[PDB]
Design a protein around this ligand. Structure first.
Ligand SMILES: Nc1nc2c(ncn2[C@@H]2O[C@H](COP(=O)(O)O)[C@@H](O)[C@H]2O)c(=O)[nH]1
Ligand SMILES: Nc1nc2c(ncn2[C@@H]2O[C@H](COP(=O)(O)O)[C@@H](O)[C@H]2O)c(=O)[nH]1
Ligand SMILES: [Zn+2]
Ligand SMILES: [Zn+2]
Ligand SMILES: [Zn+2]
Ligand SMILES: [Zn+2]
Lengths: 363, 363
């Protein structure tokens, strides 16, 4: 049944600067070294942590307790494991003694060499910091695996002009060996992944407005579809509800596409933000979702699928929760609020979990 | 004797993406909440870690061992402590019960509110990622402490155009409350710190060339001088030896200024990179120092001071060491190489230590 393995490298919405958004994807069970990244916040450093840290599991929190029981954050039916998957690790264990004798740093370089395609949702620094700082690793070997950064134009153009520009970062895309490449995707078009037998389908969404410019700020949702099984996951960039009359209904377009083309039984998960709780201070919420807005969007999807069973069986994996100087971990507050609102909206057997760094989901 | 407390938030040169360059400065012993940052890599997240982690101390390594004895990395005479200093923590402990009842996240916000001036050496992403991602914290309170980002023009112009531009990051400098400001410094000019009774004196240095543009890439060295004691520390951005005939001798200008204006006994420390070991693969070394180049620069300073005692008593704190897929921790390799070369060059009782994240130096 399981088709996808999703490694949560980073699910932090800020403002603390580590463990920001990055998810690694690979097919379930298989042992190729190749990996896809969605976004580019947490990277090599987090892979290294996961190698080292590899029951009554406790996860970091820093609110009521510095560590909290893992089960508090997840749906009881979620297929989740701490650390990197057996199949991901097997690519290192292909060489018995070599694996054993490689130190943690060396193992980190080896795993990371396999992360060869990034799908970037938007170029805000929290979504690209690891991609950028990690990038010189591409030059460690002459027989190097080359990396490609994919995105919609609002993303790629910004990376070219503002990041890989010899000012913010050396312009590694200008190196003649082309070991780092930037490539554009067309919105709404079924495009192919480079190694895995998957389709990638990107959609533009809204993510607030410029402070100085007042210009709409865009983001991306990615659909990944396994062609054999027809199973799909949706992995989202930062997003807000479309602004009533001033903006195109990009989210409605997205949900309509999903309901038309992907039967619910084939939708194995959606990784989507809920940055803020209901108490929502305006400044932190700009360009983002709170529980009422996320539930409203899921309700729209529900209406489109048009089943008396609602969204029964759908796994919603909540990402990008922000820190706040609150008494209680906002991930717990948000999870409770989402579950309450989902019940109130009769969305059925919807399974809501918070994305937890340092874990792999099997969907 | 001790005048400065230096909190090492980040001393990692990359390519792993966490704990990159950031040092917090304050006067020794005093308990004001105000703090200066030099650079802006590791920030809130690291402050939080230091709050939580607060003998046979072991520090992270990830080479021969995942953790190594602290003493291996430092000169035996170095005044160093794990965690935040008593005086830094006292600003939180001014309120007895409030401190106790504040969770770790809340304490992090409180300490971080005091970090109100950053002195940025150059705008490479590893030197600004925490500054940027942490910046929305400024909006948590209406009676907010405002933050100022200082730098030479090569730094400030790039931050304005390429970072705080509603593309890479919301342009928080355009918010009317001006809670985040960018301010330029003039090179070679004695300027005043905002709260501490210190002079700040910035100098431009070289840091390689653009990959695409071939343009010189600039960085900054900062001198901080306590006006009362006349004691100084030097805190450096990334740097390479000046390129023979193609470039101005910016480093010679710097050492000449130091030797003319700061007696060695008043020079309490220099925090300066040695990104790479002697084995130096060309690609990783570009724009940086290796032990022979760092020792050559210190030799130039030695010649200028012109004492038979060499640089006896000088604390050299080595920063920005890069990871490498080597068998041994490059910080250990580099420390050994620097000490050997210093002896070979008869630099005297030079005290060399590696900067270690999560520690405070008292100089
Ligand atoms: N005060 C204020 N903060 C903003 C504004 N626009 C964006 N931000 C902040 O910029 C940050 C961008 O990162 P993101 O939230 O998209 O992950 C957000 O945390 C948000 O709080 C704004 O217009 N005013
Ligand atoms: N291959 C290659 N890497 C470069 C070049 N210029 C800079 N870099 C890399 O860009 C990174 C910039 O961060 P920094 O090293 O300044 O902390 C460095 O790690 C360096 O390895 C270059 O011309 N060629
Ligand atoms: Zn974000
Ligand atoms: Zn964003
Ligand atoms: Zn650097
Ligand atoms: Zn640099």
């Amino acid at each position: 049944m399981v088709v996808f393995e999703i490694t949560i490298l980073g699910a932090n919405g800020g403002p603390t600067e580590y463990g920001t958004q990055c998810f690694i994807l690979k097919p379930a069970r298989t042992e190729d070294p190749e990996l896809i990244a969605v976004d580019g916040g947490a990277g090599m450093y987090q892979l290294r942590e996961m190698l080292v840290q590899g029951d009554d599991e406790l996860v970091p929190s820093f609110y009521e307790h510095d560590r909290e029981p893992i089960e508090f954050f997840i749906d009881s039916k979620l297929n989740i494991q701490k650390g990197l998957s057996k199949s991901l690790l097997q690519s290192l264990k292909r060489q018995g003694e070599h694996f054993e004798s490689a130190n943690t740093m060396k193992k980190t370089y080896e795993v990371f060499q396999g992360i060869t395609d990034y799908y970037i949702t938007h170029p805000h620094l929290d979504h690209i910091s690891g991609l950028v700082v990690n990038s010189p690793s591409i030059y460690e070997q002459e027989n190097s695996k080359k990396k490609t950064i994919w995105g919609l134009p609002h993303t790629i153009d910004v990376l070219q002009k503002h990041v890989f520009n010899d000012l913010i970062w050396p312009d590694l895309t200008a190196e003649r060996s082309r070991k780092l490449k930037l490539k554009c995707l067309n919105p709404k078009e079924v495009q192919k992944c480079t190694i895995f037998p998957w389709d990638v389908i990107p959609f533009k969404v809204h993510h607030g407005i410029g402070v100085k410019t007042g210009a709409p700020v865009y983001s991306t949702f990615y659909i990944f579809r396994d062609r054999k099984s027809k199973d799909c996951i949706i992995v989202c960039g930062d997003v807000e509800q479309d602004r009533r009359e001033s903006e195109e209904s990009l989210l409605e377009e997205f949900w309509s596409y999903v309901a038309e083309n992907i039967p619910l039984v084939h939708l194995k998960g959606i990784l989507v933000e809920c940055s803020c709780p209901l108490s929502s201070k305006p400044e932190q919420l700009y360009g983002h979702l709170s529980p009422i807005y996320l539930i409203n969007e899921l309700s729209n999807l529900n209406t489109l699928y048009n089943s008396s069973k609602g969204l029964s069986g759908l796994n919603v994996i909540v990402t990008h929760v922000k820190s706040t100087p609150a008494k209680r971990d906002p991930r717990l507050t948000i999870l409770e609020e989402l579950r309450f609102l989902a019940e109130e909206r009769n969305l059925g057997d919807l399974r809501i979990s918070i994305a937890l760094e340092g874990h792999t989901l099997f969907l």
